[PDB]
């Protein structure tokens, strides 16, 4: 039993009760990865249209 | 007053979005045309509700929201719905071809076409904000757009809004309502990519919500409508602190401070009671003691797991209705001796409590009954890690044989990104064990 | 919306194709004039998937009719929904393929293929968002077999980012006496393995056995066989044609059904199996539908599912029933047949329920299975092939049209690889 | 038909349960990695509890209680007895024990040990790993041994004055088989075993570990008189009850079983709120093997609890059918008088 930091208003009230105490990638790197994918996509398609030409 | 921009990605995100803004509107007394008679400050104001709603000179309360999907069907029902007048056409963004339950299509192939347009539309809302707090992102783990596009957006938002908090509402997949075999793949891939860009993430297991609907609301076979009405009440209880006067969880940074000590372990467990059937002509009204105790019953959790076989890093009780401090302290005091609530040694065994005297609003002609008092407990417990383990095992079963991997490699991804994403989840599982278990 | 372009090639293709249009036109409340006279708006919500709108709310099938024989396409025109089709989309030659794959693929069909693609382009152009193509054809004949597989390849070259669906009627000695069909079939499968995303294996062996044994038709007609095909074709496309969550488009179906690119050959199933013009009075219970649709006697491919394992399954229930009961009975099947579902693909069975039933039935269920048992079908074609090809029998028909023995050796090898590939994943375990 | 998976091939008990279940012809054994099961006879360590109870249209049961290792590990049990206010230092039935690491209560052990030496009381303690067991009257010997072993042991007070069976003057331990079902009904199997020594209990020399340790294993190997008094050093409750009546003028029920029944309850009731599967998405049962020592004043002492206990050859048939009847068949009923004693609790 230890209630602390009781804040009351009109809408309601808030508090804290304690039982016991204690004992990113850059915009470039994104585009690099996104195009790398599209380039693997285009190559896969190119080799298909090459295989379909044959 | 600090503004919050909601973003709804994929079907799941968009449909859960509708359920929320419908519920928010009723809670704030905002009519479906957007008019709010109770608001005496026409055009603007720094009221609590303005954090989620901008105002026009005509007195229309417009959600700070962007709906994005790579298919027009779901967002077309927002454009032609009951709350069509609520949103600007610029807020509702659609492609023509969806991600076909493929993270790769959502993140790379289709995602890359619309990402710049979406950020441009998000920036239009951001420019209306006097002091933007952050973002609440709603999406599925299973969907192609939900998984794929979100992780791309969350990356770009980190770049374009370096200092702004980002909260998730992630719909964890369940086979009772799941529409794709590869949802484990999409789930792991997005969780890995988003992990560094998400400050706090509320997972919702469809299976949990489905079972609660069947068990508590006596619904033979729940639809998304059924799940979404219940999910909206949980989301509303969490966001109530931002939209209403109060002291606890008044801004998005307070969420991570209160619930997230370890940046990677940022998945709180939400437990909500009471969920009672509108059909039930007579029902006993549950005391503060009874609803508080119910938050430690795995049946009432948004993700089914056993907190008794884990450890707590933080525990947060969010009450609505006829609740006074004396009753809550008493209820917790009694629960402490009975229940098994072990906190980690470096955190204090405490409960941060917030009370809103307005009892939970229910959409008329709904499933949920009107109750005098309800509670939503947000607890950061190392038991939620079970959710990862289940998902991670299904990933391993399929990926062992490389089943369905050609669909992802076909859209430009490498087998590298799979094993890379899985090794990050293997690390997250180990992290949750290190914090949680002694033996 | 997501438009599908239909192509029907050869006698078989144009017959099962015509019956498909007769059935789904009735289901969407469209008369032979192409005018809507339906009661439900669910009929029109996703009509643009298979139908082009025109002046005075007129619905025209997005269907291209192809054959090297005028015969079958005069029949289609004369038939009941013969007048619904776009007259320009009738693309036919004068000299047939004489059940020769070489004639259909290289010599005769090569002349006409450019004329077909002109109609494909015209139809593709006016699609808001084309999702792909479905072809009806037989692998036993010449036109559908040879020219169909050429079109598949020529369409893929113009539309390589679009789904390629096929209803491929696999031949049987019980239906046809044409000696060279195993050749035509084996050459066709080689093409399908490489150039199609989804192939519904409609086995004439199964359709005849269903008609003779189950339906008790001592002398079955092609119409008696096609009645099963048209019911199956109505069932598997139900998710594409009506509002739904599961397998709503051709790509999402492929992503749920095809775990490996080459293994895209499905076992269609239907319950209840009905005789043509016989009225079912007793509606089937949900348990009856469920047991029947998974039964070997209700499979349109002449394969025993208990001789293999299910990689993936798609169940489609139709009519007003309890969604709770379907969910229970589908779990019941899986939970009491878990040996026949690969344990390394979790939750590989997916179920859809559609309120609108087909014509003549209050309740029906359609089954789409990616079972490793399908190898039995390919093994049967392979045995028939090797019987003849071992002695180089009836090859003068193909080498006369410019082909080489090598093409046959390659087609044979690719099928034998497809078989052993299915056997690989059948014997595969969690560890 | 019901379905089950076997993930522990060694488990002699559940090898016989699987044999019995199949023989009924209403059960089917799946491949161990098939998730669509009703019953899981799970592996001993690293049992994936987190995955159980998430398969729709299947009630799922497992042959282990999650968190029962708190009772079945030696160091865990000591910590449990001490820390639990339910067991407390009102626990008179667990020998004075201390958890010794090679955080740690190694300091406090010496404080209790020094008191005994000035009291001139028996200062003989036993060190046990979580063969491998040293017994000495000198503390310096026990601590130096544990450091050399390298794993975490427990220094327990050796029952210096045990009850000795005549004729023979033999030490013994009692094994009681307890079955906790999915409703947490505690079932004590009416049949137990006396796992007896075959050499006379020698007070002087503690190095001769055959007359001091009463394990079936160390007997059949090192024992010089194996099977002379009773077959496979296993006396059953019929013969032991008769001995107590003939020698001590008391019954097994009065003298001992009342205390055994109190300890089994006390231990399992204490952990019920931690392991119980009352309102879980899966259900649990587990067989336990409680080990007891009886002293010269017929007072029962708890030695340890065994989480994966092996049954006596004679009894396997009876007990295993009981597990099927009480634990398995209760959750999954079959289609068209009690070997257990239900230890009543609330
Ligand atoms: C009864 C009959 O003629 O059936 C024919 C179908 C069978 C197959 C087994 C399915 N056939 C070809 C035969 O029975 C052969 N026998 C063999 O081939 C047999 C000989 C011994 C060695 C083994 N083999 C397999 C007979 C010698 C004919 C036919 N079915 C139709 C047919 O369906 N007609 C439809 C129109 C049609 C035709 C083709 C495709 C689509 C639609 C008419 C009506 C709607 C109907 O369904 O009955 C044939 C074409 C002629 O149709 C007119 C006709 C003539 C006589 C009887 C019935 C119909 S041949
Ligand atoms: N709770 C809930 N879950 C939903 C809803 N819609 C879909 N889901 C779940 O989300 C997953 C499917 O993802 P969706 O959101 O439909 O997909 P999407 O984001 O539109 O992506 P694509 O269609 O693949 O491009 C499955 O696990 C569904 O069970 C909904 O309205 N509510
Ligand atoms: N406090 C004590 N006093 C006297 N003897 C003891 C004792 N603790 C254990 N023993 C003796 O040591 C033997 C084995 O002890 P223990 O049961 O801890 O070892 P163990 O774990 O290898 C066998 P099990 O796993 O089947 O219980 C017992 O048979 C008992 O006679
Ligand atoms: N099920 C069915 N099979 C057919 C039909 N017409 C032909 N076939 C079979 O298909 C093969 C011959 O193909 P066909 O379409 O006549 O050749 P094409 O017209 O040159 O393509 C043989 O195995 C026939 O039995 C039909 O209407 N229904
Ligand atoms: Ca205002
Ligand atoms: Mg979508
Ligand atoms: Mg012909």
Outline the secondary-structure elements.
The structure is cut from a larger assembly and holds chains A (54 residues), B (439 residues), C (431 residues) and D (346 residues).
Chain B: E1 3-9, H1 10-28, E2 53-55, E3 61-63, E4 65-69, H2 72-79, E5 92-94, H3 103-109, H4 111-126, E6 132-140, H5 144-160, E7 165-172, H6 183-194, E8 200-205, H7 206-216, H8 224-243, H9 252-259, E9 269-273, H10 288-294, E10 312-321, H11 325-338, E11 349-356, E12 373-381, H12 385-399, H13 406-409, H14 415-436
Parallel strand pairs in B: 1-4, 1-6, 4-5, 6-7, 7-8, 10-11
Antiparallel strand pairs in B: 2-3, 9-12, 10-12
Helix pairs in contact in B: 1-5, 1-8, 3-5, 4-5, 5-6, 6-12, 6-14, 7-8, 10-11, 12-14
Chain C: E1 2-9, H1 10-27, H2 42-45, E2 51-54, E3 58-61, E4 63-67, H3 71-78, E5 90-92, H4 101-125, E6 129-138, H5 143-158, E7 163-170, H6 181-195, E8 198-203, H7 204-214, H8 222-236, H9 238-241, H10 250-257, E9 265-271, H11 286-293, E10 310-318, H12 323-335, E11 349-354, E12 364-371, H13 375-389, H14 396-399, H15 405-426
Parallel strand pairs in C: 1-4, 1-6, 4-5, 6-7, 7-8, 8-9, 10-11
Antiparallel strand pairs in C: 2-3, 9-12, 10-12
Chain D: E1 2-6, H1 12-24, E2 27-29, E3 39-41, E4 61-62, H2 69-72, H3 74-83, E5 97-100, H4 106-119, E6 125-129, E7 134-136, H5 139-149, E8 153-157, E9 172-180, E10 186-189, E11 193-196, H6 216-222, E12 234-236, H7 237-248, H8 252-275, E13 283-284, E14 286-294, E15 300-306, H9 316-328, E16 340-342
Parallel strand pairs in D: 1-2, 1-3, 3-4, 4-13
Antiparallel strand pairs in D: 5-8, 6-7, 6-8, 9-10, 9-11, 9-14, 10-16, 11-12, 14-15
Helix pairs in contact in D: 1-9
Bound molecules: a molecule of 4 linked components (O9B-O9H-OH5-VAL), guanosine-5'-triphosphate, phosphomethylphosphonic acid adenylate ester, guanosine-5'-diphosphate, calcium ion and magnesium ion (2 copies).
Organism (chain A): Rattus norvegicus
Subcellular location (chain A): Golgi apparatus; Cell projection, Growth cone; Cell projection, Axon
Protein name (chain A): Stathmin-4
What this model shows, in words?
Chain A has a two-stranded antiparallel sheet with strand order 1-2. Chain A is 50% helix and 28% strand. The longest helix of chain A is centred in the C-terminal third of the chain and has 27 residues, at 27-53. Chain A has 54 residues and is an alpha+beta fold. Chain A starts with a strand and ends with a helix. Chain B is an alpha/beta fold. Chain B is built from 14 helices and 12 strands. Chain B is globular. In chain C, helix 3 (71-78) links the parallel strand 4 and strand 5 (90-92). The longest helix of chain C has 25 residues, at 101-125. Chains in contact: A-B, A-C, B-C, B-D, C-D. Strand 2 of chain A pairs antiparallel with strand 11 (349-356) of chain B. Bound molecules: a molecule of 4 linked components (O9B-O9H-OH5-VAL), guanosine-5'-triphosphate (GTP), phosphomethylphosphonic acid adenylate ester, guanosine-5'-diphosphate (GDP), calcium ion and magnesium ion (2 copies). Residues 10-11, 69, 71, 98, 143, 145 of chain B line the site of one magnesium ion. Chain C: This is Tubulin beta chain. Chain C: The modification N6-succinyllysine is found at residue 58.
